[PDB]
Structures are given as C-alpha cells and as structure tokens.
Amino acid sequence: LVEFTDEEGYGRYLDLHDCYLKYINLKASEKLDYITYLSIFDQLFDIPKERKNAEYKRYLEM
Amino acid sequence: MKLVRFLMKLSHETVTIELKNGTQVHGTITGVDVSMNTHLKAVKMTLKNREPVQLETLSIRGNNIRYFILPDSLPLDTLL
Amino acid sequence: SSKMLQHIDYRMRCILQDGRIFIGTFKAFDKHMNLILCDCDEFRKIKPKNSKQAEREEKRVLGLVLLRGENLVSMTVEGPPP
Amino acid sequence: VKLTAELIEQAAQYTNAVRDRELDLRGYKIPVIENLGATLDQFDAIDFSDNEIRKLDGFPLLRRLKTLLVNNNRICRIGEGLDQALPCLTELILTNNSLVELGDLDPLASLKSLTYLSILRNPVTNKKHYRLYVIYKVPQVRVLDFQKVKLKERQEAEKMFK
Amino acid sequence: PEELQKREEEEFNTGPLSVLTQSVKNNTQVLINCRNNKKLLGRVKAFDRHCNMVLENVKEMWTEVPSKPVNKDRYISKMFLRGDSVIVVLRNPLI
Amino acid sequence: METILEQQRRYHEEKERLMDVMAKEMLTKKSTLRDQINSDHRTRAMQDRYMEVSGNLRDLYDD
Amino acid sequence: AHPPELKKFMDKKLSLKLNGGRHVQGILRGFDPFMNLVIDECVEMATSGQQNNIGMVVIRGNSIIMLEALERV
Amino acid sequence: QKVMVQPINLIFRYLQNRSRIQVWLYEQVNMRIEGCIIGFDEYMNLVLDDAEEIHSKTKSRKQLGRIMLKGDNITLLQSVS
Amino acid sequence: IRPNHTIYINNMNDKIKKEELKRSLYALFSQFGHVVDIVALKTMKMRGQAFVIFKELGSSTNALRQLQGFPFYGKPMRIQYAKTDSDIISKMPNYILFLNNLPEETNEMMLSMLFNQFPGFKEVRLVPGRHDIAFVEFENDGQAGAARDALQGFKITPSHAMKITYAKK
Amino acid sequence: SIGVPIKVLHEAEGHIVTCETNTGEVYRGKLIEAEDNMNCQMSNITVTYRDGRVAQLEQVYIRGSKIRFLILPDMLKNAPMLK
RNA sequence: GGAUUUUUGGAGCAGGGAGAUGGAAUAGGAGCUUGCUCCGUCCACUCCACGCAUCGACCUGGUAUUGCAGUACCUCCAGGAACGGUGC
C-alpha cells in the first residue's frame, strides 16, 4: 500500500481518473467523458488526439 | 437535509481538505463530527506557499475548512 | 466517538488562524474547541523582507494557555505525555 | 552502559528554569553520544551532566536547539561537524573537561549563531593568551566564561598571531 | 419532523435557494464565487440551509499573478464545499 | 581472512538458501491477488540480494 | 445569552477600542447581552490628534475589542 | 439600582426623531454610511432613507437612497443631527 | 547556618540584562546539580542578587564549596545558603552495623534519615543502656556495605563524628 | 453545560493572567472576573499595543470574541479539572 | 443549534520612483543557437521621501545601587541602529 493505491487493487486496475482530470484542463472544454477518454487511450498508431506539436506532449509524458 | 451527516459517513477515505488559510491537507479521514471538525491520519499538509510537511494525524476545526476534494470512487447517491 | 479525547495529554501542535503555532500539553477541550495547553510555546513565522535574508521562527514561552476555539485551525500531535 | 533511544524516551522532559524545552540526562555514565534524533526536534536544551563522553561528536540534525550542557564530562577531543547539525545554538556549556591545546578549540568558530560559551575547569584555560585566542578565533561569542567581551580584548585579540 | 420536511421542500422551491434546487432539478452547472476568489463551475448534488454543497464536474478557475496574472484553472471531479465560503451562486452561467 | 575458501563458501551457501526459499514460495499455493503480488515483490528483493552476492563472489578472485 | 457584567462600568467614563483601530471615549450609558454599548458624551479620537465629539452613540458589540475604565469603577 | 439605556431604545429614538444617522462600518475605516433611519430590526439590520457613503480618504459622498445596511457591518451609530 | 536547596547570591553585576543573567546562571549552576528554578529580580530591593533552587542538598553544598569568590561578569560573587527555604522545595561485611559516638539527643527519625540513605532499613536499636551506641540493621547486605563505607567518620553534629563497624558474631 | 477550559479560566480569576486580543495587543493583569463567553475584566493591566508600547491601564474589560488566547498562571497546572 | 465574545470566517491581494548600475553557473521568448537588441519575476549599493514617528528587546563605553525574593520589563547618559509590531 506504499506501492499501489486502492483504486489500482494490486495490479487489477489502473487509475486513469486523475489523468482524465488533467486531460479536461488540457483540452479546455468539458465535451469529453471518462469513457470517451478511454477510447482516446485505445488509440495506437492512428490520428492523434491533438496536434502532436502542441501542449499534449507534457500530459503524454506524465 | 444536512450535509454534515453526509460527511460523517466518511471514514478511511482519502480526501484533500482546503482550509480557509490557504492550506491543503491531503489525508484519510478518521473522524468527522456534527460540527464538521475533521480528524485525519497519514497527513500531507501544505501551508500557503510552503513545502508539504507530513503529520501522523491532524484534527482540523470545522469552520476553518473551506472545501473538500473527495475521492472519485465514491457513490454519493447511496451516501445521501 | 469523542476523537479529541484520544488526543488528550499529548504534546500537541495547534495552528492558529493568523499562522501561529502552539506546542503544548493538550490538557482539556470543550464544545467550541477551546484548548488548555500546559507548558505551551508559541511560534511566529517571520517574513524575511530581503532577497538574501532567511525566514526565521520566533518562539515565545507562555505556560498555561487557554486558546479560544475561534482562533484554532488544526491540531497535530508532537509527543507522548511527558 | 551505552546511550540509545531508550534512555531518551524514559528521561525527564520538561520546561527548564530559563523556560526552554529540556531533556535531562544526569548521571548515566554515557561514553558515546548517538541516536539523538528520536527527540523529534521538540527541544531547546539538553543536559549531559555526569557522563563519560570522551569526544563531543555524533550529533544529528536538530534545528530548534539553543543550549548544550556538557558539564563535567571527559571531553579530550571535540567534534568538528557540529554546526551543520545544530544550526541555531546559543549556549555551549563545556565546563569541567580535559581540553588542553588551543587548536582543540578551533572547531568552535564554525557556529555562526553562537553567543555564550563556558569552557571553565579546563587545562586549555591554563595557557597564556587563551581568552584573546578564543575571541580572535570565534568572534560571534558575546559572553565568554561568564565574562562579557570588551573592545580592548577584541583589539588585543586582533593584534596577536598576525 | 415531517411538517418541517414539507416546509423545507416548499421553501427550497420558492425561496432564495431555488436556483440550487433548480441545479438539482435539471442538472445544470452553477458558477460559485468563493471567498478566496475561486470561481466554481459545477453541478450540485445536494445542498442544505447553509449552502453547503456536494458538487460534481467542478472547474475551479482563478487568477494568479506571477506582469499579467493568468487564469490558472483546475478540474476537481467531486467535492464537498462548506457553505460560509460561498459568495454568489448564479444559476445560468454563460460559458 | 580466507577470501578464497570461507567467504566464497558463505556467499555460495547464501545463494543456495535464496534459491531454496523462492523455490519454496513457487512450490506453495497462492489464494488472493494481494498476497501473490506481495510474494512476487518479496522474491524480487531476494533476487536483488542474489545478484549483489553473486557480484561480490565474481569480484573476489583476482588475489 | 448571559448579559456582560458591565454594571461596574455604567455611568463611568470609558475608553473603547473598536476594530479597525478606532478609538472612542465616553460615559457608558447602557448595554445589552450582545455588548452593544450606549455611549454618552462620546468623543471619537482618530489617528489625527483632533477629536470629534459625536454625543450619543450605539456601538455594536462585535466591533468592540476592549474598554478601559477612565474612572475608578 | 441603576436604570439602563439599552441600545434598541436609542436606535428607536433615532427612528422616532427621524434623525440622520451616520453609521460606521466593521473593518472598513474609510467608509461611513449616513441616512435617515426609517426602520430597523432584531439583528440591527437597518434601512436608511437618502443614505450616502462617505469615504474618508477621497472625502466624497455617494448618494444611495433607501438602503438596507446589513446589521453585522455596523460598528457605531452616530447622530449627525 | 543550615543547608538549604536554594543558594542566595549577591555581589553580582547588575548592568547585565535579566534574561542574559538567567541564561548565565543556568549555565553556571548546571554543573553542580539540577537547577529546578532561578529567581532573578531586577527591582531596586533585589537587583544584583539571585536565587538558585536545586533538587538536592548536596549540590548546593558542592556549589558553596566550589564557587567561593567566583569572578562573574567582572565581580567576585558571594554565594550563601539562603536564609529561607523555597516555595517549590517547601511544596515538594554484615547487615548489622554497630554505631558508636552517637549523639544522645539524636531522634529516631534522624537516625533513619542518615542511615536510610543507603536503602531500606530493617530496624534500628538505640541504646538506652550504654548511651551513644546503636545497632543499625539493613534489609540488604549490599546496602549495608555501602553505608559502612560512607558512614564511618560521618559528621553529625560536628562536635562528634560517628564510628561505624560491622557487627560481629 | 460549561466546558472544562472556561472552568479553568474561571479558576484563573483573582490571579494575574495574560490575554492576547485579536489585534495582537497583549493585556497582562489580574483577572478580576471572567465570564462564560470568555469576557474578561482585568485590573492592573500592562498593555503591549502590538508595536511594543507597554502602557499601564487600570480596569479594562476585554470582549471574549476578540481574545486570541489566555496565558493563565502556571500554578493552576495542578487543578483537578485538568486532572 | 450560519445574525456582535469561540465552529459555516471581513477575507483576498500588492510592496514608492529613477539611474549609459550589476548577475539567471544548469531554466524566458522574439529578431528562427553562439554575440547583440527589446520586453510583463529578486537581491546589493547610491539618490529623492536612510519610507516616516513611536515603544519594547539588544551592543559598546562611563556611571549608581551590596539589596533575602517568588516576577509582562527594570538605574542614568551618549552613539549605533541587525529585530518586532502600530498609524499614514
């Protein structure tokens, strides 16, 4: 419990709620749910979410 | 209905209380009473424009808190 | 539960609204969260006012302190009962 | 008997006569000082009367301390890295020890905030040009051996060993 | 008791907290000024006599001087908010 | 000090004990995810010890 | 809701200390359980030396910090 | 054995005489709001007729009319006439 | 003069500040024993004088034995036992030893006080017969040894010194 | 009822206490009477006035809502309410 | 049991002006490195308005008190002002 948070349940789940909050701030609009956010993270080698030269880079790093 | 009763049914929940003197106290609730005084443990407490100190437990008075940050994994409709 | 009664007789640090720190043996409290602190010391943060001056903490010894509850922000423990 | 946190936790913790936070360690015959950081920086003055401490060393970072009382110990050598761990000291009470040479007082110039010193009942007091060497060595001390410094002492401290 | 529960619902329907009632009626955001100058855009889950609030989807905007001060904002997902720090609740926010 | 004989013998023995212990763990049944991850993290620290002991064993043969 | 024990300070010349550093002096003429005072011959003294006699005032209790007895009480 | 001027009596005297009342402000040393008291109530909330703010720094008086100055702001009630 | 816990001090330098005087006195008297309190008053009756309250009587005797005429802030200080007791102090080998040259007047409580210092005493018998003689019995032999070593030549009522020997079968 | 601290404050009356008001002025004097809402009246007051100006007032009455804290005499440290 | 002395807060914010003054070792942008130029963040010194006046703590020299007490603080003169807060 110094290595995992409760939402992660020891390798069962990953918390992406915090990343979803940072993502709302980054897009500057609320037109985007948690489920809509997960569809973004199902992307692999296709069209990017934002322009890859913008501020999306700091978020992607984190 | 009073929402202090909503807050009193929180224990071992990791919140982040913003106090009235610009303080940010991130810790898990051990007890809230009817006067909104919150007793936390495992506290990461950051004063205004200061480094985050850590305390084993804190006991904030009720009027001095400004707002909470509750966990996202909280079903509030069952809590009300 | 009466949670503050668990914290009784400990060396406790109490944060006031103006930023002071009261380290005292927390003897008693009540409904308004007044405190009685034995051997209590207050700690004022001192603004530096320069680019190169450090920030210091001035400590006053007080003794038996009744702290009115409207001043109190939050209390933490420092030590076991001496 | 060696010193541990056990003798810290049981000893008298109180408010002294000069109204600071005090831990008492009288009459323990401690030869080496270690494991002091369990005091959790809640103290301003720690007594060490009647211990067999050979050297004043092993001092961890405690910021709130303003007085060390090392009365009647066996300090023959002194620690040098004391100012990095005791930054806000005001009194050092080194009475009744076995300091013999002038250079043995040389680490004491590193404490910037130092104001009061007592090196009484020491052989280092016995040698000539002692007190002026202390003033010329540690200038920030205002009270030396319960004698206030004077400007004639500062001048004849600056004059010698040029 | 029960007459106070009917009294509080009719009072929250017709009184000053109606907009908070309206914010729990059709689930629209309110813009809440706080005593530390933080604007809060978010829905209200529940309120009371004190305007204590339980809030969803909160965007807290505020203005920070580093020069020109910038509109640094954060997204608090779900929160509780004490009622004495609330300044102004405006039911329909423009943007 | 018998670096050639005693120290290498002790380091070889300590390695054998570490192999026996994480073998005893992989022999035992596991019942829930927390205690699985806990043992797998424990076996990681034992592997860190094994690698360090094996490091020292390899840098003790020049003399 | 207990009234303050200002029965000593009644009809005695006071020196109030209100919040904001304000300072008024005068003969205390009455009080309520909220410590709202009624001051007769009330003279307001500002940061400037000149003192405005304002006569008969009602001071709300929550602004009072202190009151000094300028008479012996 | 002494009789007391409780402050509601004197605020009601201000009401009866319709006297123009200067009101000081809590934690606001600059501004003083003066007006004719039409009425007041339990928490010392006042209503004022032809009220005006007086900022002592700018020495300017801004007219307001009939206001309801909330009671917790009041420090002192001074009669100008 | 009787031994007290508080040592009274005059002939000090009155030009120093009171808090510096209190820090310096706590420094100067931390050596002898545990200082529980110091009374330094700067009023015109009591300036230049201090009182140091100790926990034990022996440390006050050691302070009076050491600091006769100590140069302190440019003045040789004069320490005496204080005429009154404090507020705080007033608020707070064989088992059998044969004692000789014991004062006739000696009270039972006094004997317990002197002998008891080296722990628990089983019983003491004073001689109603050959006066100035007594038997002191200790519960533990170790205690007895300590008492015997220390007590011989003990000065109680300076006119006489006690002689203590181990009882013989 | 009445809390343990206000009972200690009532015990402190007749002795020299030290109030600090909300404006930081330090009023040290003999506590003549204290009240349930911490209204304190003190005689022989020595006021500090927040910039060092120690004056001596006689017979002050401090509103309890402005009291930051109350340094009570240490001889009340053994009171049976503190137990 | 959110309307003056305690718990639903009267709190938030900013440190005067100027000078071809000085620095961002590893951390500003633009004229698309390096060198140069411009602009919305500090500290040190100098000038106007040592920001101002106040009292407390404190350092040097001279000087007075030799006194048995449970303490906001304690002699006076002159210089310097490192600290605290009050009103503008």
Swiss-Prot record, chain B:
Ubl conjugation in keyword set: yes
Disulfide bridge partners, by residue number: none
Top-rank taxon, per record: Eukaryota
UniProt PTM comment: Methylated on arginine residues by PRMT5 and PRMT7; probable asymmetric dimethylation which is required for assembly and biogenesis of snRNPs.
Localization of this protein: Cytoplasm, Cytosol; Nucleus
Entry similarity comment: Belongs to the snRNP core protein family.
Quaternary structure and interacting proteins, as annotated: Core component of the spliceosomal U1, U2, U4 and U5 small nuclear ribonucleoproteins (snRNPs), the building blocks of the spliceosome. Most spliceosomal snRNPs contain a common set of Sm proteins, SNRPB, SNRPD1, SNRPD2, SNRPD3, SNRPE, SNRPF and SNRPG that assemble in a heptameric protein ring on the Sm site of the small nuclear RNA to form the core snRNP. Component of the U1 snRNP. The U1 snRNP is composed of the U1 snRNA and the 7 core Sm proteins SNRPB, SNRPD1, SNRPD2, SNRPD3, SNRPE, SNRPF and SNRPG, and at least three U1 snRNP-specific proteins SNRNP70/U1-70K, SNRPA/U1-A and SNRPC/U1-C.
Other comments on record: In the autoimmune disease systemic lupus erythematosus, antinuclear antibodies are developed with Sm specificity.
Protein name: Small nuclear ribonucleoprotein Sm D1
Organism: Homo sapiens (Human)
Gene giving rise to this polypeptide: SNRPD1
Residues of the whole record sequence present: 1 to 80 of 119
From Swiss-Prot, chain C:
Domain named Sm: residues: 1-81
Post-translational events: Methylated by PRMT5.
Effect annotated for changing N50S: In CCMS; expression of the protein is reduced
Subcellular location: Cytoplasm, Cytosol; Nucleus
Family, per entry: Belongs to the snRNP SmB/SmN family.
Job description of the protein: Plays a role in pre-mRNA splicing as a core component of the spliceosomal U1, U2, U4 and U5 small nuclear ribonucleoproteins (snRNPs), the building blocks of the spliceosome. Component of both the pre-catalytic spliceosome B complex and activated spliceosome C complexes. As a component of the minor spliceosome, involved in the splicing of U12-type introns in pre-mRNAs. As part of the U7 snRNP it is involved in histone pre-mRNA 3'-end processing.
Subunit structure: Core component of the spliceosomal U1, U2, U4 and U5 small nuclear ribonucleoproteins (snRNPs), the building blocks of the spliceosome. Most spliceosomal snRNPs contain a common set of Sm proteins, SNRPB, SNRPD1, SNRPD2, SNRPD3, SNRPE, SNRPF and SNRPG that assemble in a heptameric protein ring on the Sm site of the small nuclear RNA to form the core snRNP. Component of the U1 snRNP. The U1 snRNP is composed of the U1 snRNA and the 7 core Sm proteins SNRPB, SNRPD1, SNRPD2, SNRPD3, SNRPE, SNRPF and SNRPG, and at least three U1 snRNP-specific proteins SNRNP70/U1-70K, SNRPA/U1-A and SNRPC/U1-C.
Record protein name field: Small nuclear ribonucleoprotein-associated proteins B and B'
Gene: SNRPB
UniProtKB/Swiss-Prot annotation, chain E:
Protein name (Swiss-Prot/TrEMBL): Small nuclear ribonucleoprotein Sm D2
GO process terms (BP): 7-methylguanosine cap hypermethylation; mRNA splicing, via spliceosome; RNA splicing; spliceosomal complex assembly; spliceosomal snRNP assembly; U2-type prespliceosome assembly
Entry keywords, A to Z: Acetylation, Cytoplasm, Isopeptide bond, mRNA processing, mRNA splicing, Nucleus, Phosphoprotein, Ribonucleoprotein, Spliceosome, Ubl conjugation
Family annotation (PANTHER family): SMALL NUCLEAR RIBONUCLEOPROTEIN SM D2
An MF annotation (GO) of this entry: RNA binding
Note: In the autoimmune disease systemic lupus erythematosus, antinuclear antibodies are developed with Sm specificity.
Pfam family, one: LSM
Compartments, record wording: Cytoplasm, Cytosol; Nucleus
Subunit structure: Core component of the spliceosomal U1, U2, U4 and U5 small nuclear ribonucleoproteins (snRNPs), the building blocks of the spliceosome. Most spliceosomal snRNPs contain a common set of Sm proteins, SNRPB, SNRPD1, SNRPD2, SNRPD3, SNRPE, SNRPF and SNRPG that assemble in a heptameric protein ring on the Sm site of the small nuclear RNA to form the core snRNP. Component of the U1 snRNP. The U1 snRNP is composed of the U1 snRNA and the 7 core Sm proteins SNRPB, SNRPD1, SNRPD2, SNRPD3, SNRPE, SNRPF and SNRPG, and at least three U1 snRNP-specific proteins SNRNP70/U1-70K, SNRPA/U1-A and SNRPC/U1-C.
Residue ranges, annotated region (Disordered): 1-19
Lineage: Eukaryota, Metazoa, Chordata, Craniata, Vertebrata
The species this protein was found in: Homo sapiens
SUPFAM superfamilies according to UniProt: Sm-like ribonucleoproteins
Domain Sm, chain residue ranges per copy: 17-95
Keyword Endoplasmic reticulum applies: no
Biased composition (Basic and acidic residues): 1-9
Swiss-Prot record, chain I:
Occurrences of domain RRM (ranges): 5-84, 95-169
Keywords: Acetylation, Isopeptide bond, mRNA processing, mRNA splicing, Nucleus, Phosphoprotein, Repeat, Ribonucleoprotein, RNA-binding, Spliceosome, Ubl conjugation
Subunit structure: Identified in the spliceosome B complex. Identified in the spliceosome C complex. Present in a spliceosome complex assembled in vitro, and composed of SNRPB2, HPRP8BP and CRNKL1. Contributes to the binding of stem loop IV of U2 snRNA with SNRPP1.
Cited function: Involved in pre-mRNA splicing as component of the spliceosome. Associated with sn-RNP U2, where it contributes to the binding of stem loop IV of U2 snRNA.
Molecular function in Gene Ontology: U1 snRNA binding
Gene3D superfamilies from the UniProt entry: 3.30.70.330
Residues annotated with Phosphotyrosine modification: Y95
Pfam family of the protein (one): RRM_1
GO terms under cellular component: catalytic step 2 spliceosome; cytoplasmic ribonucleoprotein granule; fibrillar center; nuclear speck; nucleoplasm; nucleus; spliceosomal complex; U1 snRNP
Protein name: U2 small nuclear ribonucleoprotein B''
Encoding gene, per UniProt annotation: SNRPB2
SUPFAM superfamilies: RNA-binding domain, RBD (SSF54928)
GO-annotated biological processes: mRNA splicing, via spliceosome; U2-type prespliceosome assembly
UniProt-annotated location(s): Nucleus
CDD domains the record matches: RRM1_U2B (cd12478), RRM2_U2B (cd12481)
Note: Patients with systemic lupus erythematosus produce antibodies which interact with snRNP proteins.
InterPro entries noted in UniProt: Nucleotide-bd_a/b_plait_sf (IPR012677), RBD_domain_sf (IPR035979), RRM_dom (IPR000504), U2B''_RRM1 (IPR034564), U2B''_RRM2 (IPR034562)
Family: Belongs to the RRM U1 A/B'' family.
